[PDB]
Amino acid sequence: VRGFYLRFGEGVSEEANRRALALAEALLRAPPPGLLDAVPAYGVLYLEYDPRRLSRGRLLRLLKGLPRVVEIPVRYDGEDLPEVASRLGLSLEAVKALHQKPLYRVYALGFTPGFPFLAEVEPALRLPRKPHPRPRVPAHAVAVAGVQTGIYPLPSPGGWNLLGTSLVAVYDPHRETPFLLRPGDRVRFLEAEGPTPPEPRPLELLPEEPRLPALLVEEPGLMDLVVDGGRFLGGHLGLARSGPLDAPSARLANRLVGNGAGAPLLEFAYKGPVLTALRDLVAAFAGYGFVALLEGEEIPPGQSFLWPRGKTLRFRPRGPGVRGYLAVAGGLEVRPFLGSASPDLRGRIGRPLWAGDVLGLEALRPVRPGRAFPQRPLPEAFRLRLLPGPQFAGEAFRALCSGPFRVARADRVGVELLGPEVPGGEGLSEPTPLGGVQVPPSGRPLVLLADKGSLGGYAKPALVDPRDLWLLGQARPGVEIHFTS
């Protein structure tokens, strides 16, 4: 994966946004092979592409050849409404009236799936976000911060000033048109009475009646996920790439059982599931952090094996690493959502496996067991190559390379680092780059991975080289990190 940003104007500029949108829309209408995402936000367009299939130059040449009012009923019952009014010298009714006055435009979409960033808030209603965010803003909260207003589609942390509750759900993965709002839509708020819409319900991807039942989840691990290659061309809606966090290991597991590299398989981290075969299977285990246990025998990663009906497969934690993959010959049966079977847990698309889940084969594609391929060794400390990021600063790059960092926390969203102080920053939200080293004005650097949010306002002075991202798929607390040029 590689990416670059086109920038058509700073701040909240209507014409800059029209430009970025026109280009993104034209690409998304007819995406060239190798285009992975096209994400507009304010005056910025981020393009992500596979350089093996699409060159930057070819993509830039393509760009040269390219060419609705939504009503939001709102109950103004927001927890911050009295404080907002007081801080602005306004009556409660004056706040409500100011909020409804503009014809807003959606300048960006997808801080979480379907979350609209709307502008412009009337000057008299502009006030800063809260010094400390709430850990949980409720679904459908309508909020303001500075020149922007937004609607939280799902419960999430947030520091915007809560004015009310939307009486329509802006995001619902179960309806015909999941996203009520699109980038560039115009929006009007209107005071109304009515019930609070329900929270979005998780969308099931796994079939209820698998055609070829294969295995039973007897006990779940910490977070077992059925993943494919990832979800592409969805960043403009807030949908994460997802897919496997250690992609080479996932691809190896699939290849060992004769599957395509991106066929659906199981990813697990830290603690694995307890699984029992419902038919005779050929399966393969790859990745790190465990040895598979079957019928008393240990199976190290990087090989396929016969998994007989009624026999239980377990994963014994071992060595460095935390993330394993289990593939089955034929792949797993999973329903896609917008081109992919991969979960978007932020968007409640799919879910981790539960005790009692039955998974099935996509097709009968028998292969012999006992294949093996060598895995690259996983080092005890990580040497990560850094590239300049979109908010590059020499002093930040220097700080990042100045001494060792240590992993504080690691998951599919990113890897949080402890180490030397790195100067950071914040600005308008722009599309997040995979491997972005996010550095806030105050706080720990976070390396952004596959389940990262699509948008972020914190500075990214550097990017981890895509060739080293697989290592961060195996990060755990205490691992030493050395950044290099």
The structural domains of the chain, ordered by start, are 1-67 (3.30.1360.40), 68-200 (2.40.100.10), 201-375 (no CATH), 376-485 (2.40.100.10)
Under 8 Å between Cβ of 348 and 202: yes
Residue 165 has which token pair? 């509750």
Report d(CA 112, CA 138) in Å as an integer.
Answer: 13
Strand order, beta sheet including 35-41:
2-7, 44-49, 35-41
Resolution of the model in angstroms: 1.8
Residue 413 has which token pair? 């969203």
Q: Which of 449, 439, 432 is nearest to 417 (CA)?
A: 439
Task: Tell whether the torsion through CA atoms of 396, 397, 401 and 405 is positive or negative.
Answer: positive
Which amino acid, one-letter code, is at 16? A
Helix (H) or strand (E) holding 99: helix 92-100
Under 8 Å between Cβ of 135 and 142: no
Under 8 Å between Cβ of 205 and 343: yes
Instruction: Note every long-range contact of 65-71, with CB atoms under 8 Å and residues 24 or more positions apart, other chains counting.
Output: 66/22, 66/23, 66/26, 66/27, 67/22, 67/26, 68/182, 68/185, 68/186, 69/103, 69/185, 69/186, 69/187, 69/188, 70/180, 70/181, 70/185, 70/186, 70/187, 70/188, 71/187, 71/188, 71/190
Report d(CA 457, CA 438) in Å as an integer.
Answer: 9
Strand order, beta sheet including 323-328:
225-227, 265-269, 323-328, 281-287, 303-307
Strands 382-388 and 480-484 turn out to be parallel
At 166, is the secondary structure helix, strand, or coil? strand
For 295, other C-beta atoms within 10 Å of its C-beta total 12
